[PDB]
Amino acid sequence: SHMCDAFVGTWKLVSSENFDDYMKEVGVGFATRKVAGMAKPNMIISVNGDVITIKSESTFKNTEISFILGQEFDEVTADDRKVKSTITLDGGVLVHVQKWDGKSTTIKRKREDDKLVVECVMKGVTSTRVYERA
Ligand SMILES: C=CCn1c(S)nnc1COc1ccc(Cl)cc1
Secondary structure, three states, X not given: XXXXXXXXXXXXXXXXXXXXXXXXXXXXXXXXXXXXXXXXXXXXXXXXXXXXXXXXXOOOOOEEEEEOOOOOEEEEOOOOOEEEEEEEEEOOEEEEEEXXXXXXXXXXXXXXXXXXXXXXXXXXXXEEEEEEXX
């Protein structure tokens, strides 16, 4: 009974494009790029009241964020950046902006057919990561 409804569930990574180039743009080092690029995460999304939780479980590094839309929070990313994040809903798309060290990256998550498509942008470099229901 909320529009974030169509994101809720357990999702498994099924394709990725350009993720190595995105990670380079972000500043991820060689060994982390290689190990992280292998990972096939499951993404678990839930909602409880105003609080959204997004968990990522993988061979590389389990993560979990909980947040309220529009309200900034601290996040330690899988690659160990300490970032300040704000997530909003813009026309049905969850828009996640991460700021650190004067840099910014945006991760958009949207439902498209039976997929959840994740677009990660750092400057001119975009990676597209497609998830299907587990
Ligand atoms: C950015 C995309 C969000 N995401 C997806 S989709 N799968 N894993 C992640 C978490 O972000 C990472 C950032 C840098 C590295 Cl090295 C590894 C993961």
